[PDB]
Amino acid sequence: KKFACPECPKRFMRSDHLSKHIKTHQNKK
Ligand SMILES: [Zn+2]
């Protein structure tokens, strides 16, 4: 529900710091 790294079952309260986190899930490529 809401926004949150769809890759890992975590929880966040924003889209900025939340996006930067998912940025490490797709290193390069
Ligand atoms: Zn994640």
From Swiss-Prot:
Modification after translation (UniProt): Phosphorylated on multiple serine and threonine residues. Phosphorylation is coupled to ubiquitination, sumoylation and proteolytic processing. Also implicated in the repression of RECK by ERBB2. Acetylated. Acetylation/deacetylation events affect transcriptional activity. Deacetylation leads to an increase in the expression of the 12(s)-lipooxygenase gene through recruitment of p300 to the promoter. Deacetylated by HDAC6 which leads to increased expression of ENG and positive regulation of angiogenesis.
Subcellular location: Nucleus; Cytoplasm
Superkingdom of the organism of origin: Eukaryota
Phosphoserine PTM positions: S15, S19
Entry-annotated residues carrying N6-acetyllysine: K20
Gene induction: By insulin.
Tissue specificity of this protein: Up-regulated in adenocarcinomas of the stomach (at protein level). Isoform 3 is ubiquitously expressed at low levels.
Residue positions the entry lists as glycosylated: S15, S19
Renumbered zinc finger spans (C2H2-type): 3-25
Function: Transcription factor that can activate or repress transcription in response to physiological and pathological stimuli. Binds with high affinity to GC-rich motifs and regulates the expression of a large number of genes involved in a variety of processes such as cell growth, apoptosis, differentiation and immune responses. Highly regulated by post-translational modifications (phosphorylations, sumoylation, proteolytic cleavage, glycosylation and acetylation). Also binds the PDGFR-alpha G-box promoter. May have a role in modulating the cellular response to DNA damage.
Comment text on domains: The 9aaTAD motif is a transactivation domain present in a large number of yeast and animal transcription factors.
Similarity annotation: Belongs to the Sp1 C2H2-type zinc-finger protein family.
Protein name from the UniProt record: Transcription factor Sp1
Organism: Homo sapiens (Human)
Residues of the full protein shown: 684 to 712 of 785
